[PDB]
Design a protein around this nucleic acid. Structure first.
Length: 71
RNA sequence: UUUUUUUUUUUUUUUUUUUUUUUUUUCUCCUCUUUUUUUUUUUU
């Protein structure tokens, strides 16, 4: 008896096009664990432009799952 | 030195009654365009 709030893990297909655009300028990423997701993200810092990180994490933010309650 | 007579304003009053807003038409009718639909997160 309580009410908790989950974010069940994602699946590859919202990452697929992400990788596509990731596979266009340089960066290699992989999708196996939120640890290595966040690590292989936060390093990639394109030198001569600022938008890249925002934009990439924003397509990343178009990927994932939902947060809903359950007993 | 000029007398006498020729009516006038219809009579009547001491009759019963048990309903009810309105009211009566007008036909079938091509909604144009990046999408699957995004989604955690924190500050109200």
């Amino acid at each position: 008896q309580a009410l908790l709030r989950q974010h069940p893990p994602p699946h590859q297909e919202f990452f697929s096009e992400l990788r596509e655009c990731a596979k266009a300028k340089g960066f290699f990423i992989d999708t196996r664990s939120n640890k290595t997701l966040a690590d292989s993200l936060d390093n990639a810092n394109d030198p001569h432009d600022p938008i890249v990180n925002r934009l990439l994490r924003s397509m990343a933010t178009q990927a994932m799952s939902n947060a809903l309650y359950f007993s």
